[PDB]
Amino acid sequence: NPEYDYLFKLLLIGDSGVGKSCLLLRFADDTYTESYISTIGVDFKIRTIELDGKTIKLQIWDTAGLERFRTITSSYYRGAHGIIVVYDVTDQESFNNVKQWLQEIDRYASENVNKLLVGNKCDLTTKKVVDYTTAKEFADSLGIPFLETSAKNATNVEQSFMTMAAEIKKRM
Amino acid sequence: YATVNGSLVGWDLRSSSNAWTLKHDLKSGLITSFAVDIHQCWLCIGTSSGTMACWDMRFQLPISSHCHPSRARI
Amino acid sequence: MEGKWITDQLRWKIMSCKMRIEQLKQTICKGNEEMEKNSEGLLKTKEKN
Amino acid sequence: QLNVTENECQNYKRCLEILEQMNEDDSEQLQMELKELALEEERLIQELED
Amino acid sequence: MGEAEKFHYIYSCDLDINVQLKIGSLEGKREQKSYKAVLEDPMLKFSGLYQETCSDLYVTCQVFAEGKPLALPVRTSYKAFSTRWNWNEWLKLPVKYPDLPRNAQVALTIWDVYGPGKAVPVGGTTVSLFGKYGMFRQGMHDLKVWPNVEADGSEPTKTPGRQMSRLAKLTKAHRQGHMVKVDWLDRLTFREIEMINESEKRSSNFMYLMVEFRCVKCDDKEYGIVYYEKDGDESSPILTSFELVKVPDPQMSMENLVESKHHKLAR
Amino acid sequence: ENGLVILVSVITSCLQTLKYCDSKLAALELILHLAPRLSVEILLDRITPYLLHFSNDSVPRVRAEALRTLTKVL
Amino acid sequence: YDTELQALHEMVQQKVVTLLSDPENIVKQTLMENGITRLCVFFGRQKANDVLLSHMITFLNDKNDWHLRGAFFDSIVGVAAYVGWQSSSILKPLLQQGLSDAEEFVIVKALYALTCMCQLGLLQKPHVYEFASDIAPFLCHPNLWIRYGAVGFITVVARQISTADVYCKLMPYLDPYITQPIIQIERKLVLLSVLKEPVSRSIFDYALRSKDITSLFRHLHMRQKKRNGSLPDCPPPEDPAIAQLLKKLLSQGMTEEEEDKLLALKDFMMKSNKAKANIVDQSHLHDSSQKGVIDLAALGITGRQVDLVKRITTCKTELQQLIQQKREQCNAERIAKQMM
Ligand SMILES: Nc1nc2c(ncn2[C@@H]2O[C@H](COP(=O)(O)OP(=O)(O)OP(=O)(O)O)[C@@H](O)[C@H]2O)c(=O)[nH]1
Ligand SMILES: [Mg+2]
C-alpha cells in the first residue's frame, strides 16, 4: 500500500491520573495541559512514523483508567499489537497495579502482544517514590521494555512509542 | 419522526411507547430533513439554516453539528 | 500544682484563642474569596443578561 | 514493696524540686497575652460578621 | 470467532460458599472543610476531613433482608491512603448464597475518624444482591454514596446505590463488547460523555464506591447465581376432586405436638 | 383476643404440612404478631410445640427464624 | 431451686462453650457481640475465669482472622469486669499483644478495651502507668485511629489518677509527644491540640516494612546518640541494606524529629513487624482469593445450562424471565453486530 507499510494498534493502559492521555497528546499533538479530564471509554489518535525505512501508521488508543468506567471483560485489548502500561512514578499504587494490568493484558490481549512499562511523571523528581531500579528489575523479570517518560516536558515520550513500533515491527 | 418543535421521537410500533426522543437544538434551525444510518448507529438532522447535526443512536446524545458555509437550507 | 494549674488554665485559654484567631482569619480569607468569585460572577452575568 | 514505695517518694520529691526550682509563671504576663488576643478575636468577629 | 452462547447458572441455594464483595475505590470529593462548623465544634478539626486530604477511611459491609441484618458487619482492613481511596479488598461476608433471600442487600458505610473513639459516616450506599430477575450481581459496580449517613438496610432502602447513570452503563457495555464498535463514532461520542462527566463532577459532590462481585468459574465457564429455593421445582400435586373428602384438613395424619409437649413434661 | 385462640388453631393446623420457605416464614411472622395477644397458656402449650417443630425444619432460614421467633415469644 | 438453678447454669454453660469452640469465627464473633457479658452470670465469677475467659483468650491465637481478634477486645471488658481483679493478670500480657497486632484496626480495638478497663478501674494501679508508657508513642503514630485511640486512653488515665500523678507519673511519658505540657490533658481537646505532628505515613511504612527493621533502629538509635551528644560521631550504616534504607528515608523527607518518634515506636514497630511477618508465611497458601475467581472443583455443585438460541414458584417463574432476557440480549447483540 502506498500510504503506509504497517498499521500497529497501540493501547495505553494504567491507573487514572498516570498520564495516559497526556502521553498520547504529547506524541500525536506535541502538546501538554494540566487540565485533567478523566478519559471515559476509548479515544485514539493517529501518528505515522518513519522506522527502519518503513512507513508505520500508529493508531494509539487511550482508555479509561478509572474503575468507575472499567469492567472485568475488556474488548479494547483485541487487535492491539502493543500495550503500554503506564504508571505514575510518584504514585506507588499505580506501579503496584501494573501486575493487575498485566493480567488483563495476558487474558484479554493477543498471546504475543508487545508490552512496555512506562513510568510517567519522571519530571517530578522530588515526589518520585518508585525508583528506576525497582521498576527496571520488575520489567526485566517479565522481559517487557521499560522507560521513564514525561508528557510535561516531552522527556522520552517519542522513544517509548518508537520502541514499541520497532519491537512490533521486529515481531511482524 | 421529527417535529417542528425540535423533537426527533422514536416511536415503537409494536408497542405504543417511545424507544427514544432526541431534543434537537432549535437554535440550530428548523428540522427540514433527517437521515438515519443504515447500520442504525447514528443519525443526521438537516435544518433550515444549513446545520446538519449528528446523533449517536447507541448512546442517544449529539456528537457533531456542522453547518453549511452559506447557511443554506438542507 | 495549685500555682501551676492556674497559670496552665491561661496557657490553654491563650492557646485556645490562638486556634480561634487562626480559624477565624482563614474563614475571612475564604469568605473574601467568595466575594471576588461571586461578585465577578455577578458582573459577567449582568453583561451576559 | 519498700523499694517501690521509696522510689515513689523519690519521684514526688524530685517533681517538688522541679516545681519549686522553676519560677512560677506570672499570671499577669500570660494574662495580658490572653487579653491582647481577646481584643483581636472580637475585632475579627466583627469583621467576620460584616 | 467466538465461544458459544450457552447460559450457565447455579441455584443460589446450591452454592454453599461465603459471599465475597470487593471494596474497590471511593471516587469523588468529600464535603470540603466547612470552617463555620469548626468554630461551633472544635472537635471537628480533629477529624479525618480536616487532617488529611485522604483520611484512612474504612468500609463496613453488612447484609440485610426484610430490613433486618443477616449477620454482623465486616470491616475493611486498615489501608493507609494518601491521594486516593483504593481499598482493593475482597471482604468475605458472613452470609452464604443459600442464606440469602431474594431481597438481600449489602449496606456499605464509609467511616472516618471523628476524634477519639468515634467514627462518623462519610456516606452510605445499599445495593440489592440479586438483580431484577433474581440473578446475583456480577462484576464491577459503581454505587452512589449518600453523604453523611450510614447505609440503610431497611426495605426499601433510603440509600440506593443503583445522565451519567445511563451513560456509564452504556460505557460499561461498550467496554465489555456488548455495544457495537464504531471507531469514528466512539471517538466522537466519548468526548461528549467526558464533558457530561466533568460537568457532573463540578455540578455535584457525588461519590461512588466501586465494588465487585466474584465470578463463579468451572472449566472456563461463567455461571450466574440465580436465586432459588430447594424444592423450587416441586410443583404441588394439587387436584380438584371433592367426591368424598369435601373438607381437607392439613393436620390430618400428623403428630399431635401439643400432646407430645405434654408427654415430655409430665412423663 | 378471646376469639384469637380460634384463629390460632387455623394457623397451627397448617404448620406441620407447609412446603415452601416463604409459607413457613410467613407462618412464623403470624405467630410473632399474634404472640403478644395470646395468653401464656396458649403460647407455651399451643405455639411452642410448633416453634420447636420449625427448629427441626429442612430449610436453614426456617430453622434460624424458628429459634428467633421462639426467643421473642418466650 | 438450688438444683434447678444449677442445672440451668450448666445447660447454658455447655452451650456457650460449644459456641465459643465453633468451627466458624463468625459464630464465636456473633456470640461475643450479643451477650457474652450477660452469660457470665450463668458461669459464675469463678468459672467465668476458668472456662469462659480461657476460651476467649484462645481467640487471640487466630492470626489469620483479625475480626475475631478485634471481637475479643470489644467484649473482653465485660468479662474482665465480671471476673474481677483475678483476670487482670491473665489479660495484661494479652492486651499488650493487642497493641502490636498485625492489623492496626485490632490495635485500635485493643486501645479502646484498655481505655474502658481503665475507666472501670480494672487495670491495676502500676499497670495503668505501664500501659501509658507503651501507648504514649502512639501519640505520633501516622494512623489517626491509633493516634486518637491513644489519646482516648491517656485522657482517661489522667482522669483516673490524681493531679499529682499527672505531673509526676503520666506527664513524663507524654512530654516527647506534646508541644506544650498542659495539665488539662484529661480533656481530649487539650491533648489533641498539644500533640506533635505524627510520623509521616511514608516514612513510618518504609521503616516498618523493611525486612532488617531491627538493624535499622539499631542504626537510627546511634544517629540519635550523635544528636543527643552521647556519641562524638555516628558512622554510616555498616550494612548495605541499612545504607539504602537510610538514604531512602532521608530523601523521602525523614526529619530529625521523625527519627525520634520512630525510635519511640521502635518496640511497637519491631513486634508489629514480626506479627505481620508470621502471617505472611501463611499468606503464601491463601493467594487465590485475591483473584476474583471461584473454582467449583472444591464442591462439585450442580451446574446448570440453557441454550439462548431456540403452583409455579416465584423463583421458578423468575428464572424463566431471566433466561428470556438472556435470550433477547444475545439476539439483540447478534443482530446489532450483523448490521455493521
Ligand atoms: N508533572 C507531570 N504531570 C503530569 C504528567 N502527565 C500527566 N500529568 C498530570 O496528571 C494529570 C492526569 O493525566 P491524564 O493524562 O489525564 O491521566 P490519564 O491516564 O489519562 O487518566 P485517565 O484519563 O482518567 O485514565 C494531568 O492532568 C496532568 O496534570 C507528567 O508527565 N508530568
Ligand atoms: Mg486518558
DSSP code per residue over D13-33: HHHHHHHHHSPPP-HHHHHHH
E265, F44 Cβ separation under 8 angstroms: no
The SS3 call for residue A106 is helix
Residues of D with CB under 8 A from a CB of C: 19, 24-25, 27, 30-31, 33-34, 37-38, 40-41, 44-45, 47-48
Phi, psi for E245 (deg, rounded to 5)? -100, 85
CA separation for the pair G146, G152 (Å, rounded): 10
Amino acid code (one letter) for G333 = E
DSSP A61: E
CA distances from G310 to A138, G323, G328 (A): 50, 12, 11
Q: Find the helix or strand (DSSP H, E) in which B31 lies.
A: strand B31-36
Q: Do C12 and G167 touch (CB under 8 A)?
A: no
Sequence-distant contacts of D14-22: CB under 8 A, at least 24 apart: D15/G167, D15/G168, D19/C1, D19/C4, D19/G167
Question: If you measure from the C-alpha of residue E207 to the centroid of ligand 1, how many angstroms do you get, rounded to a whole number?
Answer: 21
User: What distance separates the 2 farthest-apart alpha carbons in chain E?
Assistant: 86
Q: Which three cell numbers stand for residue E195?
A: 464533558
CB neighbours of C4 closer than 8 A, spacing ≥ 6? D19, D24, D25, G167, G183
Q: Cβ distance G40 to G82 under 8 Å?
A: yes
Distance (Å, whole) CA G170 – CA G154: 8
Sign of the alpha-carbon torsion through G63, G66, G71, G77: positive
Give residue A133 CA to ligand 2 midpoint distance, Å: 27
Closest CA to E211 of E12, E8, E67, E74: E74
Contact A69, E168 (CB under 8 A): yes
Beta strands at E58-65 and E105-113: parallel, antiparallel or unpaired = antiparallel
Resolution of the PDB structure in angstroms: 2.7
> What is the DSSP-derived secondary structure letter of residue G187?
S
Q: What is the CA radius of gyration of chain E?
A: 25
Which residues is A84 bridged to in the sheet? Answer: A12, A116
F61 shares contact with chain E (CB less than 8 Å): yes
CB contact under 8 Å between G167 and C15, yes or no, is no
Ligand 1 atom nearest to A63, measured from its CA:
25
Return the ligand 1 atom nearest residue A151 CA: 31
Cα(G172)–Cα(G164) distance, integer angstroms = 12
Q: Give C19's contacts in chain E (Cβ within 8 Å).
A: 42, 45
Residue A6 parent element (H or E): strand A6-14
Residues contacting residue A105 through CB under 8 Å, at least 6 positions apart: A13, A77, A83, A85, A113, A115
- DSSP class of residue G183 equals T
Cβ–Cβ under 8 Å, residues E140 and A71: yes
DSSP A155: B
Chains D and B touch (3+ CB pairs under 8 A): no
Q: Is B14 on the interface with G (CB under 8 A)?
A: no
| Cα dist from G62 to E115, G69, G71, G108, G277, whole Å | 30, 7, 12, 18, 15
Q: Show residues of chain E in contact with F16, CB under 8 Å.
A: 250-251, 254-255, 257
Q: Which residue of A has its CA nearest to G292?
A: A72
- CA-based R_g, chain C, Å: 21
Q: Which three cell numbers stand for residue A110?
A: 493477543
CB E147 within 8 A of CB E239: no
Total Cβ atoms within 10 A of residue D26: 10
Distances from the Cα of C9 to the Cα of D35, G175, G183, angstroms: 14, 18, 8
3-class secondary structure for chain E?
CCCCCCEEEEEHHHCCCEEEEEEEEEECCCCCCCHHHHHHCHHHHHEHHHHCCCCCCEEEEEEEECCEECCCCEECCCCCCCCCEEEEEEEEEEEEHHHCCCCCEEEEEEEEEECCCCEEEEEEEEEECECCCCEECCEEEEEEEEECCCCCCCCCCCCECCCHHHHHHHHHHHHHCCCCCCHHHHHHHHHHHHHHHHHHHHHCCCEEEEEEECEEEECCEEEEEECCCCCCCCCCCCCCCCCCCCCCCCCCCCCCHHHHHHHHHHC
- Is A104 in contact with A13 (CB distance < 8 Å)? yes
Angle (deg, nearest 10), helices G2-20 and G25-47:
140
Shortest distance, CA G163 to any CA of chain D (angstroms): 12
Distance (Å) from CA E182 to ligand 1 centroid: 26
Q: Per the CB < 8 Å rule, is G180 touching C4?
A: no
Determine whether the interchain pair A72/G252 forms a contact, defined as Cβ–Cβ distance below 8 Å. no
Strand order in the sheet with B61-67: B31-36, B42-47, B51-56, B61-67
Q: 3-class SS at G309? A: coil
Tell me how close the Cα of E142 comes to any Cα of chain A, in angstroms: 6
Distance from CA of G70 to the nearest CA of A (A): 27
Q: How far apart are CA B28 and CA G40, in angstroms?
A: 79
State which residue of chain E sits closest to A45, comparing Cα positions.
E187
CA dihedral defined by E86, E91, E97, E103, rounded to 10 degrees? -60
> How far apart are alpha carbons A168 and A60 in whole angstroms?
13
Contact B65, B28 (CB under 8 A): yes
Residue A29's SS3 state is coil
Instruction: Give nearest CA residue, ligand 1 atom 1.
Output: A121
| Contacts with E39 (C-beta within 8 Å, 6 or more apart), sequence order | C20, C23, C24, C27
> What is the C-alpha end-to-end distance of chain E, expressed in Å?
75
Interface test with E, best of G319, G325, G327 (most E CBs within 10 A): G319
Whether residues F16 and E260 touch (CB distance < 8 A) is answered with no
Residues 113-142 of E with CB under 8 A from G: 113, 115-117, 131, 133-135
Neighbors of chain G with 3 or more C-beta pairs under 8 Å: A, B, C, D, E
Q: How many CA atoms lie within 13 A of G63 on its CB side?
A: 16
